[PDB]
Design an enzyme around this catalytic site. Sequence first.
Site, PDB file in Angstrom:
ATOM      1  N   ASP A 121       0.840  -1.195   0.000  1.00  0.00           N
ATOM      2  CA  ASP A 121       0.000   0.000   0.000  1.00  0.00           C
ATOM      3  C   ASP A 121       0.885   1.260   0.000  1.00  0.00           C
ATOM      4  O   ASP A 121       1.816   1.404   0.809  1.00  0.00           O
ATOM      5  CB  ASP A 121      -0.898  -0.046   1.254  1.00  0.00           C
ATOM      6  N   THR A 159      -7.085   3.025  -1.964  1.00  0.00           N
ATOM      7  CA  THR A 159      -6.622   1.682  -1.673  1.00  0.00           C
ATOM      8  C   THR A 159      -7.586   0.566  -2.134  1.00  0.00           C
ATOM      9  O   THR A 159      -7.197  -0.317  -2.900  1.00  0.00           O
ATOM     10  CB  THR A 159      -6.209   1.571  -0.185  1.00  0.00           C
ATOM     11  N   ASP A 261       2.252   3.069   3.093  1.00  0.00           N
ATOM     12  CA  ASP A 261       1.141   4.035   3.109  1.00  0.00           C
ATOM     13  C   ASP A 261       0.867   4.648   4.493  1.00  0.00           C
ATOM     14  O   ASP A 261       0.704   5.868   4.626  1.00  0.00           O
ATOM     15  CB  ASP A 261      -0.140   3.390   2.585  1.00  0.00           C
ATOM     16  N   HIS A 265       1.216   8.793   5.083  1.00  0.00           N
ATOM     17  CA  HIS A 265       0.205   9.750   5.510  1.00  0.00           C
ATOM     18  C   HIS A 265       0.749  10.701   6.608  1.00  0.00           C
ATOM     19  O   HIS A 265       0.492  11.902   6.558  1.00  0.00           O
ATOM     20  CB  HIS A 265      -1.072   9.072   5.991  1.00  0.00           C
ATOM     21  N   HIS A 309      -1.033   2.256  -5.263  1.00  0.00           N
ATOM     22  CA  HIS A 309      -1.019   3.711  -5.600  1.00  0.00           C
ATOM     23  C   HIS A 309       0.218   4.275  -4.949  1.00  0.00           C
ATOM     24  O   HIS A 309       0.816   3.604  -4.144  1.00  0.00           O
ATOM     25  CB  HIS A 309      -2.285   4.466  -5.096  1.00  0.00           C
ATOM     26  N   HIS A 420      -3.240  10.553  -1.083  1.00  0.00           N
ATOM     27  CA  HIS A 420      -3.293  10.029  -2.430  1.00  0.00           C
ATOM     28  C   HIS A 420      -4.751  10.005  -2.744  1.00  0.00           C
ATOM     29  O   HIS A 420      -5.576  10.239  -1.843  1.00  0.00           O
ATOM     30  CB  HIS A 420      -2.710   8.593  -2.445  1.00  0.00           C
ATOM     31  N   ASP A 691     -22.766   4.295 -28.480  1.00  0.00           N
ATOM     32  CA  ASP A 691     -24.248   4.287 -28.513  1.00  0.00           C
ATOM     33  C   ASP A 691     -24.843   3.706 -29.785  1.00  0.00           C
ATOM     34  O   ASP A 691     -24.345   3.952 -30.881  1.00  0.00           O
ATOM     35  CB  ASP A 691     -24.794   5.706 -28.397  1.00  0.00           C
TER      36      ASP A 691
HETATM   37 CA   LIG Z   1     -22.777   4.520 -24.622  1.00  0.00          CA
HETATM   38 ZN   LIG Z   2      -3.519   5.767   2.280  1.00  0.00          ZN
END
Ligand SMILES: [Ca+2]
Ligand SMILES: [Zn+2]
Length: 805
Positions: A121, A159, A261, A265, A309, A420, A691
Site C-alpha cells: 500500500d 486503496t 502508506d 500519511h 497507488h 493520495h 451508442d
Molecule cells: Ca454509450
Molecule cells: Zn492511504
Amino acid sequence: WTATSGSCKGRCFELQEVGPPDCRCDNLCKSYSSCCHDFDELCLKTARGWECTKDRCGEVRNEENACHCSEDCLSRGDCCTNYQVVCKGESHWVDDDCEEIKVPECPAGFVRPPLIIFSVDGFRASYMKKGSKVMPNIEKLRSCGTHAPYMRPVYPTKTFPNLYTLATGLYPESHGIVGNSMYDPVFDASFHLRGREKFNHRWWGGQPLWITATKQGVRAGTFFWSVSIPHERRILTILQWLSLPDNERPSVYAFYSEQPDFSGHKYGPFGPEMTNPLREIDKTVGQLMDGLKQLRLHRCVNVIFVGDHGMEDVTCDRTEFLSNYLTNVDDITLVPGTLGRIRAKSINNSKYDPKTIIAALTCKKPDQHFKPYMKQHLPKRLHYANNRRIEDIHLLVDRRWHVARKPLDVYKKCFFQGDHGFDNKVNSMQTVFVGYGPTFKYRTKVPPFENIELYNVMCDLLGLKPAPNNGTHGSLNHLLRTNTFRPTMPDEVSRPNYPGIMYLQSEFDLGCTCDDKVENKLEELNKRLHTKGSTKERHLLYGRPAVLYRTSYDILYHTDFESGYSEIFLMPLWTSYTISKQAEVSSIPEHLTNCVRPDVRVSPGFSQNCLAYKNDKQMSYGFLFPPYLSSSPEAKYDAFLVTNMVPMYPAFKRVWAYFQRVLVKKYASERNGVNVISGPIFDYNYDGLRDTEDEIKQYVEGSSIPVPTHYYSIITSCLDFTQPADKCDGPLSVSSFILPHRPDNDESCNSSEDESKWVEELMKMHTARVRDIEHLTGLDFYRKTSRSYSEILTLKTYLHTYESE
Ligand SMILES: [Ca+2]
Ligand SMILES: [Zn+2]
Ligand SMILES: *[C@@H]1O[C@H](CO)[C@@H](O[C@@H]2O[C@H](CO)[C@@H](O[C@@H]3O[C@H](CO[C@H]4O[C@H](CO)[C@@H](O)[C@H](O[C@H]5O[C@H](CO)[C@@H](O)[C@H](O)[C@@H]5O[C@H]5O[C@H](CO)[C@@H](O)[C@H](O)[C@@H]5O)[C@@H]4O)[C@@H](O)[C@H](O[C@H]4O[C@H](CO)[C@@H](O)[C@H](O)[C@@H]4O[C@H]4O[C@H](CO)[C@@H](O)[C@H](O)[C@@H]4O)[C@@H]3O)[C@H](O)[C@H]2NC(C)=O)[C@H](O)[C@H]1NC(C)=O
Ligand SMILES: O=C(Nc1ccccc1)c1cc(S(=O)(=O)N2CCCCC2)c(Cl)cc1Cl
Ligand SMILES: [Cl-]
Ligand code: NA
Ligand code: NA
C-alpha cells in the site's frame, strides 16, 4: 451471535470458512468478532520471536514458540525463515547471484508453479530508485525479474478501488468500489473503511481472481489479512499453506502490507521517517524468499510485487473550502479530500440544483485548486461515471491539495503530511510492478502499463480463463517467458460499400451553396484515379479500421484523405489522412468560406443538409479532414464535401480549428510526418461504449443529424523518427485524444485568451488510449501493419500522459 466456545485446535488459519454460530479460525474472524476463545493462544503465537539464533539450533520442539528451529521443522513446514541460514550454514536468498529460471523447478506433486501476490500500500514508483540502498531483496527481485519503471493505478487512486481492480481487471465504475467511502441509493446504504458494512457482498461486483480460481478448480489462499496479525505471521502462514498435501494446497496466495502508506500519511512520501518502513518491507520480502528457498520453492513460485497507488505531499493549509464559494453549503453532502463528490443533503429538497452548484464552483478564484465537473464530462480516460454510487457532481482536485466543505471539518475531524487519491496520470500516484519467477522473463524491463491488465496475466499464470474484464488480453504477453495467450483480431461484422458516381447535382436540395463552377485531359484521368483509391496507401497506412457492429457504411476515397461514411449517422465514423513533415498549411479562400458541396457518390437521403445548421442557432459545423491541409487548390474542393462535415458548437470550433490549423502541422514537424484518424463519438449514457442510434439524446434542430458527445483523433508515426510516418519499417508511436463536444469552454478558465494559451492544455487533459476509442466507436484499428498482434495490442493500450520524468 457467535458461540466463541469452540476450539481452533489444529484449525489455525483454516482455508474454508465455517457457518456461524460455529466460531471461526480464519484470518478474517477478528474483523467479525467471531474468533474462537483460543485463537490468540493457538494461532497467534509469539514466544521467542521470529528468528532462529545459534543456541536454538536442533532444539526440542516447543509448540508455544512462534516458529521453530528443531530438526523436524522442515517436514512440519514451520521453521523460522532463517533456520537453514543460522543452523545449516545456508546463505540468504538475497546473497545468491541470480540465475535465470528457464523452467519451473518444483517439488513432485506440484501441477503448476504457485503464484504469490505481494501487495504494498502506498508504494510510490520512485521508491524503487530512491530507496534502493535500503531494499536489497526488492532490488534483487526487480533487477533479476521483469519490471516496469512504473504502473498506472486506476482513478480514484485510493486503496480499495485499486486492490479490487487488481483482483478483477475492472474499472471501479464496473466493479463498484468507486471510493474509500460510498452511498448506494438503490440499497440506501453507506460503505466505509471502518466497520462491517464493507464485508457485505453486495458492494463487490465482477469476479475476483480467488473466485475465478475456485470455479475452475484452483485453490486460493485468502486475499485479506486482519490488521492486527503481524507481517511475520502472514508470511509463516503462507509458507505453512505451501506445505499442505497436493490436494489441499492453494495455488494462489496474497500478502498485503499497510506500509509504507500508513507512514506516508504521517510524514509525507519522502519524510526521513520513511526509510524505516522501506527497510521493514524489504526484510519481509527477505523472509518470504528465504522461506521459499528452504522449501525448495524459490525457483518454482511466480512472485508479483505490486503497489496499489503512490503518495503525494499534502498538508492542512492546502485545503480549499466549499464554504468560500457556496452560500447554500448546508444543503450539500461532500465526500471530501483528494477528490470531491457532491450530492444534495436531502432528496426532499427540490430547490437543490446541480447546475448552479457547478456554476458557483467554476473559475471563481485566480489559482483555484480544484475543478468541478458533471461526471459525464470528466476525461474519458478516467472511466469514472457509469455507477449510481458516483455522484453527478465531481471535483478533480489538484495534486498536493484537499477540498473540504467547511473549515470546521479540517480542525474538528495538522495531522497529516501525505495523501493520495488524485487523477491517475499524476507522477506521484504511480506505483510499482515486479514479476519474478519461471513464467516471467529474466532481467527484462517492460514499458509502463495499467493495473487493469494484471488480472488477465494472473489468470494466464494459473492456467485460468479470465472472466470478462477491462484489460486487453495479450497486451502484456511481452512480460512472459511462456504461458502467453494468443489472441486473434476480432472479425469485421459489416463490410463497406464502395459507391461510384450515382447522383446528379440537381437531385440535392440541401440548401448548401458553393462558389465552385470554375473550370483538362491529363488532370481528369488523375482525379478519377484519386476517387478510385490511387493515393489510399499514402493516407490509410495501417489498413482500414474494421467495423465490429452491424451497420451500413461507405468507403469514400479522395486525393488527401479516405473516410468510412455512415449512412445511419449521416457522417464519417472515421477519416484517415497522412501529413508529411514537408506539408504546407494554406487557408480557406474567401470564395469558399461557407461552401458545402453535395457528394454525388451518396444519396440526398443519406446526407446532411445546410438548412438544419442555419435553423439551429446553437449548432454550427466543422470538417473532419481540415481544408487547411489540402495538398492543392483543386484538392481543397474535396474538403468541403457534405460527407466530410460534422456538427460542432461554435465554442468547440475554437478548439477544433486550432488543432487542425496549428497542432497537426506542429506534430508532423516534430514527429517526421503523422497519420491522423479522426471522427465523432456518441456516448450519451456515459458507459464508455458506442451508442446505438436509439440512444442519441440530441440532433441538429429539425433533422436526423445526431450530435456527437465527443470528437477523437489518433495520431500515429514511426517510433524511429528518422523514418517518415509513411515509410516506417519498425515499431509505431501513437498519441490520441477524446475531446468533449461542449457548447461552452467553461472547463478552460483561460478560454477568453488566444487558443495558443489553453487549447493544447485541454487536449492533454483528454489524452486517451486507442483502446478507449475502440470501445466508444466499435471500430478496430491497426488491422494491416507489419508488426506482431501482441505489439499492436500494447500500442493500443498506450497512454501519452504529458507528465515529466
Ligand atoms: Ca454509450
Ligand atoms: Zn492511504
Ligand atoms: C469493462 O468490462 C466489463 C465486463 O466485461 C464491462 O461491463 C459489462 O458490460 C456489459 C454490457 O453493458 C454488461 O452486460 C449487461 O449485463 C446485464 C446482466 O447484468 C448482470 O450480470 C453481469 C455478469 O454476470 C454482472 O456482472 C452484473 O453486475 C452488475 O450489476 C451489479 C449492481 O446491480 C453490480 O454488483 C456489479 O458490479 C455490476 O455493476 C455494473 O454493471 C451494470 C450493468 O450490468 C451497471 O449498471 C452498473 O453501473 C455497474 O457498472 C449483473 O449482475 C444484462 O441485463 C444486460 O442486458 C440488457 O441490455 C441488452 C443489450 O444487449 C439487452 O439485449 C438485454 O435484453 C438487456 O436489456 C433489458 O434490460 C435493459 C436494462 O435493464 C432494458 O433497458 C431493456 O429494455 C431490456 O429489457 C447486459 O447484457 C455487463 O453486465 C457488464 N459487466 C460488469 C461486470 O460490469 C464494461 O462495459 C467494460 N468497460 C468498458 C469501458 O469497456
Ligand atoms: O481485493 C481485495 N484484496 C486484495 C489483496 C491483494 C491483491 C489484490 C486484492 C479485498 C478483499 C476483501 S475480502 O476478500 O475480505 N472480501 C471481498 C468480496 C466479499 C467481501 C469481502 C476485502 Cl474486505 C477488501 C479487499 Cl480490498
Ligand atoms: Cl473516496
Ligand atoms: Na447554426
Ligand atoms: Na472559460
